[PDB]
């Protein structure tokens, strides 16, 4: 009953009993993934999280937690496909769990600049953020075919799908990410 479902991408694999769970690291006492979820809920009514480790912890703030399919496809695209297979609704706005400062006009500006494309993603002036992406339903079959072919590359897929970057270079530092605990300590 809403147009775009927000999705926090909180990683997968744990391809050695995980290691740090980045989405659960705390920034000012609140888990990084919840900073992203709260920023998505400012702009969207329906927000879910894709998480494959510590699921009961991710379930604690009351959002639906979606796990990756048993296919165990690689990379961020696997979480996108698993969410589209488990959620109805024509559009998704994905965002990784490590970009806590995303702006309240993310969905609006991606939608305004979509210009007929089935997928658009953020460019911050210096680099593409292809996992911060507004994606139409019609991508689901193409994504399934690409991952079943053994591919993983995100930007290559977003280009194959006919997407384009949307310029958010005027949003100073809204797209900074926390790569490690060492980086997180400098943002407290
Ligand atoms: Li653990």
Domain boundaries, the chain: 1-188
Distance 184 CA to ligand 1 centre (A): 20
Show Cβ contacts of residue 144 under 8 Å, excluding neighbours closer than 6 positions. 81
> Which residues fall in the annotated binding site for GTP?
9-11, 22, 50, 68, 98
Calpha distance 127→44 (Å, rounded): 25
Q: How far is the CA of 54 from the centre of ligand 1 (A)?
A: 8
Cα 78 from Cα 96, distance rounded (Å): 13
Fold entry, domain 1-188? Spore Coat Polysaccharide Biosynthesis Protein SpsA; Chain A (3.90.550)
Judge contact between 118 and 162, C-beta under 8 A: yes
Q: What angle do CA 45, 13, 17 make, to 5 degrees?
A: 120
Method: X-ray
Going from the Cα of 116 to the center of ligand 1, the distance in angstroms, rounded, reads 44
**Of 10, 21, 3, 18, the residue nearest 99 (C-alpha):** 10
CA geometry: angle at 9 spanning 49 and 71, to 5°? 95
Q: Which of 129, 2, 147 is nearest to 82 (CA)?
A: 147
Q: Give the phi and the psi of residue 78 in degrees, each rounded to 5.
A: -65, -40
Task: Measure the CA–CA gap between 11 and 69, rounded to whole angstroms.
Answer: 13
| DSSP output for the chain | --SEEEEEE-----SSS-SS-GGGSEETTEEHHHHHHHHHHHH-S-EEEE-SSSHHHHGGGS--EEPPPTT---SHHHHHHHHHHH--SSEEEEEETT-TT--TTHHHHHHHT-TT-SEEEEE-SS-EEEEEEEEETTHHHHHHHHHHTT---HHHHHHHTT-EEEE-TTSTTTT----SHHHHHTT-
Cα radius of gyration (the chain):
15
């Amino acid at each position: 009953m809403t147009t775009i479902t927000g999705v926090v991408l909180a990683g997968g694999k744990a391809r050695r009993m995980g290691g740090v769970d980045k989405g659960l690291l705390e920034l000012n006492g609140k888990p990084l993934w919840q900073h992203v979820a709260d920023a998505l809920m400012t702009q969207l009514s329906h927000v879910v999280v894709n998480a494959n480790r510590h699921q009961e912890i991710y379930q604690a703030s009351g959002l639906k937690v979606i796990e990756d399919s048993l296919a165990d496809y690689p990379g961020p695209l696997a979480g996108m496909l698993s969410v589209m297979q488990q959620e109805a609704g024509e559009w998704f706005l994905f965002c990784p769990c490590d970009t806590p400062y995303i702006p309240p006009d993310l969905a609006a500006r991606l939608n305004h600049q979509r210009k007929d494309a089935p997928v658009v993603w953020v460019h911050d002036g210096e680099r593409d953020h292809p996992t911060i992406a507004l994606v139409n339903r019609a991508i689901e079959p193409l994504l399934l075919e690409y991952l079943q072919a053994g591919e993983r590359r995100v930007m290559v897929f977003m280009r194959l799908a006919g997407g384009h970057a949307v310029d958010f270079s005027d949003h100073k530092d809204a797209f900074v990410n926390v790569n490690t605990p060492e980086e997180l300590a400098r943002w407290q």
